[PDB]
Write a protein that binds this ligand. Structure first.
Ligand SMILES: C[C@]12CC[C@@H]3c4ccc(O)cc4CC[C@H]3[C@@H]1CC[C@@H]2O
Ligand SMILES: C[C@]12CC[C@@H]3c4ccc(O)cc4CC[C@H]3[C@@H]1CC[C@@H]2O
Lengths: 8, 229, 224, 8
C-alpha cells in the first residue's frame, strides 16, 4: 500500500 | 502535555503550502481536462497532507495501520475544508489554486460537479458568515483527521485537548461563556456538512474513474478504493 | 420557541417522542426493515412538527429538512434503542438483530458494523435520554440548513439546553465543553452512515429485491 | 409530494 510507505 | 497556546502554534506551523494547478490558459476546458487539473492538484496536495498529519499532536504515536485508516477516511474531507477556507475571501468562487479560481458556471463543465460546487460555495459562505478564524480552522482540520475514522482512548484524549484549545481561543477573543459553547457547537456542526460533501465527492470521483474520464494516480486510486464504493 | 427555558425545551422534546413500532431471507429481512422504516416515517413527521421552531418554517423548508435528514433520524433512533444491547441492533422490540444477521443482506453487514460502533460509543459515553432528544432535533434542523437566523437561533437554544443538562449533572465547565464536542462529533458519523445507507437502499431499489412504498421512494429520490 | 401532504 502506497500510503503505508509514504507515512514512513 | 501541550498547553492550548502550544497546540495552536504547533498546528499553525504544520500548515501545508498553497499549491498551484497545471492550468493552461491557452486552451478551453473539457470535462476531461478540468477533472485532470483537479485530480492532479489533489494528488500533489496529498503528499503534503501526509507530512502535515505526522505533525498533528498524537498522530505519529498511532500504529502505521491506524494512521493509514484515518487518512484513508478523511483525505477528501481535509482537501475540502482547505478549499472552503482558501475560498472565504472570494464570494461565489472556489479557489482550488491561485491560478484556478472557478465559479459554479465553470463547474458545469464536468457532469454532476456543479451540485458539489454549490455545496462547497454554501459552506464557504457559512465560514464568512461566522468570521471563521485561522486558528479555529486548523483545529477543525485536525479534528477531522482524528475523528472521521475513529469509530472504525488516546485519540479521544487528543480530541478533548483540541476542544480545550478551541474554547481557549474563543475566550481569548473575548466571547462570553455562553457564546463560547454556542460557537463551539456551530463550528462542529460544519463537520457534518463537510462529511456529507466528501461522501458526495467520493461517489463523483468514483463515477469519473468508472467512465474512464481521467487517469488517476496510483495513490489516488488506493485512497478512493479505501471507500469501497 | 426561542422563549422556552432549558427545562421546557427538554420537556417539549421528551413529549414529542415518536412511538416504538413493532416489526430469514434477503428479501424477507429487507422487507421487514423497509416496511418498518415506512411506518416510522409517518410518525417522524408528527414528531418534527413538535420540535420547537420547526412549524415556523415554510412548508418548502420543512419538506427540505426532512428529505435531507430522515435516514439520519431513523439511524440515531436505532442506535439509541440498541445502546443496552451490545452487539445487537434493536430495530423493534420484537426484532433484535445480531451483527452476523446483517450478512443476510448484501452490503448490509458493513452498515451494521458502523451502527453497532456508534451504539458502543453512546454506551461508553453513557448517553442520556435528554441528550439523545436534543441531538435528534439538531440533526433535523442542521443537516439541510446550508441550503436565515431563526433556525440558527433555535440551534443555539438546543446547544444551551445540552449544556444545561450537563451542568445539572454536575460536570465542570471543562467537562461540559468536552462532552458537548464529543456528542456533536458523533453527528459526523451519523451523516456518514446515512449517506452509505442511502446508497444501499438505492441499490436494493434497482435490483427490485424488495417493494418500496411510494413515500420511501420519494424520500429516496430526493437524494437524487 | 406525499411528504407535502403528510405535513398537511
Ligand atoms: C473529488 C473531486 C476532484 C478533486 C477536487 C479537489 C481537488 C483539490 C482540492 O484541494 C480540493 C478538492 C475538493 C473537490 C474535489 C472534487 C469533488 C468531486 C471531484 O471528483
Ligand atoms: C435503509 C436501510 C433499510 C432501513 C433501515 C432502518 C429501518 C428502520 C429504522 O428504524 C432504522 C433503520 C436504519 C437502517 C436502515 C437501513 C440501512 C440500509 C438499508 O437499505
Amino acid at each position: 500500500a502506497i500510503l503505508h510507505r509514504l507515512l514512513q | 502535555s501541550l498547553t492550548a497556546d502550544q497546540m495552536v502554534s504547533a498546528l499553525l506551523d504544520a500548515e501545508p503550502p498553497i499549491l498551484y494547478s497545471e492550468y493552461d490558459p491557452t486552451r478551453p476546458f473539457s470535462e476531461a481536462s478540468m477533472m485532470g487539473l483537479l485530480t492532479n492538484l489533489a494528488d500533489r496536495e496529498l503528499v503534503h497532507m501526509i507530512n502535515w498529519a505526522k505533525r498533528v499532536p498524537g498522530f505519529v504515536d498511532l500504529t502505521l495501520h491506524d494512521q493509514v485508516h484515518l487518512l484513508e477516511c478523511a483525505w477528501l474531507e481535509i482537501l475540502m475544508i482547505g478549499l472552503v477556507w482558501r475560498s472565504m475571501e472570494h464570494p461565489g468562487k472556489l479557489l482550488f489554486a491561485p491560478n484556478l479560481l472557478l465559479d459554479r458556471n465553470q463547474g458545469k463543465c464536468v457532469e454532476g460537479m456543479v451540485e458539489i460546487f454549490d455545496m462547497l460555495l454554501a459552506t464557504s459562505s457559512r465560514f464568512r458568515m461566522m468570521n471563521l478564524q485561522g486558528e479555529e480552522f486548523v483545529c477543525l482540520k485536525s479534528i477531522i483527521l482524528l475523528n472521521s475514522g475513529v469509530y472504525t482512548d488516546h485519540i479521544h484524549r487528543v480530541l478533548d485537548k483540541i476542544t480545550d484549545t478551541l474554547i481557549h481561543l474563543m475566550a481569548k477573543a473575548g466571547l462570553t461563556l455562553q457564546q463560547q459553547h454556542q460557537r463551539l457547537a456551530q463550528l462542529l456542526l460544519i463537520l457534518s456538512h463537510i462529511r456529507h460533501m466528501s461522501n458526495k465527492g467520493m461517489e463523483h470521483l468514483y463515477s469519473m474513474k468508472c467512465k474512464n474520464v481521467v487517469p488517476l494516480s496510483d495513490l489516488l486510486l488506493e485512497m478512493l478504493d479505501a471507500h469501497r464504493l
